[PDB]
Design a protein around this ligand. Structure first.
Ligand code: HEM
Length: 153
């Protein structure tokens, strides 16, 4: 469980992410799709994109970046009390999208890389540790829902 001091670090940087959700979304999806190409194959709507330049040019990709970050933001601001927000997400990602838990680990690492690139001053090692802990909590709760449904990972 994160302390109140650790949640503050998390939400202090997230308030900067929120100044430009779309640019953040874009960087994070592209980082993920380049680092772990197998993730790109889950998206019929993106599968055609072959280069980084094509990814950067895609308005639909940018739109879906905002979608993801806005959902994640709603969860982070619950400070761990995120039952109502998490449930629908695990359900669709386990059963409809077929997303292994391992990919949620990949996208976590993309989020931490981009926050460190864009926000060094607010994202020192103490902030990075807090954000890793929040993302682990997110992953741990989703994984429990997966298990229930028979999809664990
Ligand atoms: C930070 C974690 C993630 C969050 C907050 C998240 C959130 C969302 C949201 C809110 C939607 C739209 C509503 C829905 O269908 O449930 C969505 C759709 C989807 N997500 Fe995620 N997602 C996450 C991770 C991922 C990852 C890691 C992948 C694939 C590697 C994935 C695959 C998908 C797919 C295939 C769709 C449907 C897109 C479409 O065709 O419209 N998601 N996600």
């Amino acid at each position: 469980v994160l302390s109140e001091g650790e949640w503050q670090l998390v939400l202090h940087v997230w308030a900067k992410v929120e100044a430009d959700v779309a640019g953040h979304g874009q960087d994070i999806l592209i980082r993920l799709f380049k680092s772990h190409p197998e993730t790109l194959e889950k998206f019929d709507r993106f599968k055609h994109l072959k280069t980084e330049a094509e990814m950067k040019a895609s308005e639909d990709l940018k739109k879906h970046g905002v979608t993801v970050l806005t959902a994640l933001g709603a969860i982070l601001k619950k400070k761990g009390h995120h039952e109502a927000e998490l449930k629908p997400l695990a359900q669709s990602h386990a059963t409809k999208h077929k997303i292994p838990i391992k990919y949620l680990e990949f996208i976590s690492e993309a989020i931490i890389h981009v926050l460190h690139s864009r926000h060094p001053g607010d994202f020192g090692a103490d902030a990075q540790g807090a954000m890793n802990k929040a993302l682990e909590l997110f992953r741990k709760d989703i994984a429990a829902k997966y298990k229930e449904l028979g999809y664990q990972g």
